[PDB]
Write a protein that binds this ligand. Sequence first.
Ligand SMILES: NC(=O)C1=CN([C@@H]2O[C@H](COP(=O)(O)OP(=O)(O)OC[C@H]3O[C@@H](n4cnc5c(N)ncnc54)[C@H](OP(=O)(O)O)[C@@H]3O)[C@@H](O)[C@H]2O)C=CC1
Ligand SMILES: NC(=O)C1=CN([C@@H]2O[C@H](COP(=O)(O)OP(=O)(O)OC[C@H]3O[C@@H](n4cnc5c(N)ncnc54)[C@H](OP(=O)(O)O)[C@@H]3O)[C@@H](O)[C@H]2O)C=CC1
Lengths: 192, 192
Amino acid sequence: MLKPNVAIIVAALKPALGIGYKGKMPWRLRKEIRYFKDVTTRTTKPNTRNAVIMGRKTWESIPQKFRPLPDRLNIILSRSYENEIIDDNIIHASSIESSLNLVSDVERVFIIGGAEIYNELINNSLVSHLLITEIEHPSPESIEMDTFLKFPLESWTKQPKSELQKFVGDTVLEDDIKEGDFTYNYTLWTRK
Amino acid sequence: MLKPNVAIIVAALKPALGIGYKGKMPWRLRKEIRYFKDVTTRTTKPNTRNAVIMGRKTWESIPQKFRPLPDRLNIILSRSYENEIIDDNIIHASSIESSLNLVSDVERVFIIGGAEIYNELINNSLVSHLLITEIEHPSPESIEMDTFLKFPLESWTKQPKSELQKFVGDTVLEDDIKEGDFTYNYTLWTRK
Ligand SMILES: NC(=O)C1=CN([C@@H]2O[C@H](COP(=O)(O)OP(=O)(O)OC[C@H]3O[C@@H](n4cnc5c(N)ncnc54)[C@H](OP(=O)(O)O)[C@@H]3O)[C@@H](O)[C@H]2O)C=CC1
Ligand SMILES: NC(=O)C1=CN([C@@H]2O[C@H](COP(=O)(O)OP(=O)(O)OC[C@H]3O[C@@H](n4cnc5c(N)ncnc54)[C@H](OP(=O)(O)O)[C@@H]3O)[C@@H](O)[C@H]2O)C=CC1
């Protein structure tokens, strides 16, 4: 049985693993936006592309002129949708199982959020990598939030930086990136 | 209809998962036949129907006067078949997926046999659910059988009864149904 190559990509504030407040991210991290773009857009060969899968709320939080996310197939989930290919760049899917059946033309698949989607996928056997941007701040409790990852990190193994570099290819991975009061690092995890 | 979830519905004798002999089921479970009927017929949406898919041999095994099965779109597969709508109830097709392009009326899709169809379709990623009637008998080696399921069950998760109830909605699910020397239970399985 052929299966797609799927990873979760997310940015979280430690230690609680907070992901959002209201319907947005509690930070604006310049370099992290760029990493996100590169990682999700990069392919091993030209004239190929990846897909991104998101929840309706995340699609909606993207300003209209900036959607779909360029250079990648965008897949949007809503329990109100009918499976439908809108154009070459946008597909509507009515369940996770269908979403994973609509990625036949891409190289890699990235689950890009939000909370409910992440929580639904982390226990799917198809997900073989977690790409976590671990964020730190002097006083995390000062950062307001209502959305958290509920991942069983004990059943995942954080890999050495070398393994991440293997996955991201040519992208530069700086350590301990500072922006304002935040410090962060990109990480890669595999299943135990 | 684009990439629908499909469910396999079958009754098998444990542990070998035997399904027939000659071209017949080695038992007559009256309650099972009624459950089969309710599950495959019932819908939630307004003016929808479910679709049942079968191999050419299974079709031919239903007495001509009792086909098509009432209240469901019957889809019959054969490698010699052109993709054609016979009438509003019957479709001919050479592939599951090609058959699905000709439907629109549909809520749920069920694979109802036969053995070759079962063993082949099991490894098609459109299949998301298995409804297996697990039958037991004191002497499973007194019930001669020639046909078996070749299901990779290590890749599947047997769900709790609460999840089956939720799938079937209204249908009454009795436990440990005894008929003659047979004892059976209804089960649901999903992909890991
Ligand atoms: N820190 C990070 O890296 C990221 C953070 N986030 C954050 O996450 C938050 C949003 O998450 P959340 O509110 O949970 O929204 P999501 O983006 O997860 O969207 C949830 C919606 O997706 C649909 N959906 C979910 N499950 C299914 C299913 N099985 N089948 C079909 N449709 C499904 C439903 O749509 P409908 O209601 O239409 O049925 C549901 O309301 C924001 O705060 C956002 O900033 C987002 C991405 C990255
Ligand atoms: N226990 C249970 O719940 C059930 C048990 N059964 C049992 O199953 C047995 C019958 O199974 P079987 O004889 O194999 O018959 P099937 O109903 O599976 O028919 C096989 C035929 O289907 C067509 N076909 C097969 N594979 C495909 C494919 N991949 N794509 C398109 N068409 C295909 C072919 O038609 P062509 O040759 O024209 O190409 C082939 O000969 C019996 O003993 C019956 O009692 C059946 C249903 C339920």
